[PDB]
Amino acid sequence: SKGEELFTGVVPILVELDGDVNGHKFSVRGEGEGDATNGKLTLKFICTTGKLPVPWPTLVTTLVLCFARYPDHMKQHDFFKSAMPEGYVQERTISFKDDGYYKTRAEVKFEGDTLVNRIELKGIDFKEDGNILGHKLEYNFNSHNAYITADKQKNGIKSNWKIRHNVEDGSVQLADHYQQNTPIGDGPVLLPDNHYLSTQNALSKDPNEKRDHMVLLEFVTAAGITLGMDEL
Numbered sequence: 001s002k003g004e005e006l007f008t009g010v011v012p013i014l015v016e017l018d019g020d021v022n023g024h025k026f027s028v029r030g031e032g033e034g035d036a037t038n039g040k041l042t043l044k045f046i047c048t049t050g051k052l053p054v055p056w057p058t059l060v061t062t063l064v065l066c067f068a069r070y071p072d073h074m075k076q077h078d079f080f081k082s083a084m085p086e087g088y089v090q091e092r093t094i095s096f097k098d099d100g101y102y103k104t105r106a107e108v109k110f111e112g113d114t115l116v117n118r119i120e121l122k123g124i125d126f127k128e129d130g131n132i133l134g135h136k137l138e139y140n141f142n143s144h145n146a147y148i149t150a151d152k153q154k155n156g157i158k159s160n161w162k163i164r165h166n167v168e169d170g171s172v173q174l175a176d177h178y179q180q181n182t183p184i185g186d187g188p189v190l191l192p193d194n195h196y197l198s199t200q201n202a203l204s205k206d207p208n209e210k211r212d213h214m215v216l217l218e219f220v221t222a223a224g225i226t227l228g229m230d231e232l
Contacts, residue, residue: 001081001082001083001084001187001188001189001190003081003082003083003084003085004075004078004081004082004084006081006084006085006110007034007036007037007066007067007081007084008036008037009035009037010033010034010035011033011034011035011036011067011113011114011115012031012032012033012113012114012115013030013031013032013033013034013041013043013064013067013114013115013116013117014029014030014031014111014114014115014116014117015028015029015030015031015043015045015063015064015116015117015118015119016028016029016030016116016117016118016119017029017030017059017062017063017118017119017120017121018119018120018121019054019059019119019120019121019122019123020121020122020123021053021054021100021102021121021122021123021124021126021132021133022100022123022124022125022126022128022133024053024054024133025049026047026049026050026052026053026054027047027048027049028045028046028047028048028052028059028063029045029046029048030043030044030045030046030063030216031043031044032044032216034064034066034067034115035067036066036067036068036069036081037069038069038219039067039068039069039219039220039221040067040217040218040219041064041067041216041217041218041219041220042216042217042218043063043215043216043218044206044209044213044214044215044216045059045063045213045214045215045216046209046211046212046213047211047212047213048211050211050212051212052212053133054123054132054133054135055131055132055135055136055137055139055165056139056203056214057137057138057139057140057141057165057203058094058096058102058132058137058165058175059121059214060141060201060203060216060218061092061094061163061175061177062092062094062102062104062106062119062121063117063119063216064108064115064117065080065090065108065181065197065220066080066081066083066084066108066115067115067220068080068197068220068221068222069219069220069221069222070222071221071222071223071227073225073227073231074195074222074225076190076192077190077192077193077195077222077225078190078192078222079148079150079156079157079181079189079190079191079192080108080181082188082189082190083181083183083184083185083187083189084109084110085109085110086109086110086183086184086185086187087107087108087109087110087183087184087185088107088108088109088156088181088182088183088184089105089106089107089108089181089182089183089184090104090105090106090107090108090179090180090181091103091104091105091106091179091180091181092104092177092178092179092180093177093178094163094175094176094177094178095175095176095178096126096130096131096132096173096174096175096176097173097174097175097176098130099125099126099127099130099131099132099173100123100124100125100126100127100130100132101123101124101125102121102122102123103121103122103123103124104119104120104121104122105119105120106118106119106120107184109184131165131167131173132173136167136168136169136173137165137166137167137168137173138165138166138167138168139203140166140203141165141201141203142163142164142166143198143199143200143201144161144163144164144198144199145161145196145197145198145199145223146159146161146177146196146197146199147159147161147194147195147196147224148192148194148195148196148197149194150191150192150193150194151180151182152191154180154182155182155183155189155191156180156181156182156183156189157180157181157191157192158178158179158180158181159177159179160176160177160178160179161177162174162175162176162177163175163176163177193225194224195222195223195224195225196222196223196224197220197221197222197223198220198221198222198223199218199219199220199221200218200219201216201217201218201219202216202217202218203215203216204216204217
């Protein structure tokens with residue numbers, strides 16, 4: 001696969017998300033660019049339907065792992081770029097402890113020159129005065145490592161990890177993520193050995209933006225595979 005050749009420069013990104021949590025419907029649009037050479041994403045997200053009914057931090061993971069920086073000695077484990085341009089489906093369940101769960105299905109694929117992430121989200125069994133629907137989470141997102149494994153019986157990958165959202169009272173709200181990715185096209189894809197992605201996220205606000213929004217700077221770097229002398 002020559003998909004990684006599409007990410008050697010800066011690539012424009014479009015994110016479109018339709019959501020429905022406990023019947024509270026919303027839409028989010030994001031635009032920005034990705035620089036996989038550096039593992040860097042910069043996007044601004046707008047809730048186009050007005051007020052976002054869940055906290056922005058709970059949507060970070062849902063709102064393009066093809067922009068992760070894989071070190072040269074790990075390029076053969078980059079499932080995400082290998083599926084391009086035709087793309088992959090990314091599906092998750094995010095179970096919030098003592099609260100409801102998100103189900104997401106996204107298609108990440110090139111449309112013209114733009115890498116597009118188009119998402120459908122449904123949220124169910126939330127407490128209307130819990131940490132999510134009650135907007136009790138701080139506007140931040142802790143640094144975290146998420147271990148990847150191949151899913152050979154599905155020609156894809158899987159990953160599960162716990163996100164820990166800071167609650168405003170000082171507690172922590174667990175978000176248990178279960179993820180699966182499978183290619184859209186039929187071409188060859190890279191099934192990686194076990195490894196992990198290291199992420200950092202900086203959330204901010206645009207002073208001249210009146211709508212409900214999130215400015216996001218994100219870094220994603222692949223790690224965890226031995227570069228053991230044999231290759232140097």
